[PDB]
Amino acid sequence: ISLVSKNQVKVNGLYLNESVYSSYLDFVKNSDGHHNTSNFMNLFLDNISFWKLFGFENINFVIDKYFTLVGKTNLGYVEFICDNNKNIDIYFGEWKTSSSKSTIFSG
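Structure tokens predicted for Toxin A:
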């Protein structure tokens, strides 16, 4: 986290284990095609209630160019990143089954 002003608080990066990542995946799937914009992450942060961490509710978290989100599945880890036009897509992800290994390697 990073602090900017009285109301604006900069969000840098998030790391999520299995249960919080599964809740995040359910929130992603339940959205009506709103899984791309960076304003979606403000809705997920309001769903997870970081204002309970910060005490008072009137805080607008800002998402900036290099925001990241490293989830974790049962088999491996998937990390996301924001880009120059404020959109979130996968950066890297690698879940390793006992017989086969999968990567994505965005690029």
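The helical segments are 18-30, 39-48.
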